[PDB]
């Protein structure tokens, strides 16, 4: 297994870093992997974002 790069965004809500980190973490965990890195996408408002791109790696 290698690590997998994944991209998620929403067109209906802007959310904080914490929400997107949570989404990335839980996505990797559902795939039996661990989140290694991530970066926010599509900054919104003064402190929010509309997506995240992240890398899930083998346990
Ligand atoms: Cu974070």
From Swiss-Prot:
Amino-acid positions noted as binding Cu(2+) 1 in the UniProt annotation, renumbered to this chain: 17, 21, 38
Residues of the full protein shown: 133 to 189 of 770
Effect of residue 21 to K: Greatly reduced copper-mediated low-density lipoprotein oxidation
Gene behind the chain: APP
Impact when changing residue 14 to S: Binds copper. No dimer formation. No copper reducing activity
Effect in UniProt of substituting residue 7 to N: Binds copper. Forms dimer
Source organism per UniProt: Homo sapiens
Residues of the site described as Required for Cu(2+) reduction: 40
Region (CuBD subdomain): 3-59
Cysteine pairings via disulfide bonds: 3-57, 14-44, 28-56
Designated name of the protein: N-APP
Binding of Zn(2+) 1, residues: 53, 56-57
């Amino acid at each position: 297994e290698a690590c997998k790069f994944l991209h998620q965004e929403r067109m209906d809500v802007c959310e904080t870093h914490l929400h997107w980190h949570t989404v990335a973490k839980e996505t990797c965990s559902e795939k039996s992997t661990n989140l290694h890195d991530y970066g926010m996408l599509l900054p919104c408002g003064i402190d929010k974002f509309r997506g995240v791109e992240f890398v899930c790696c083998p346990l």
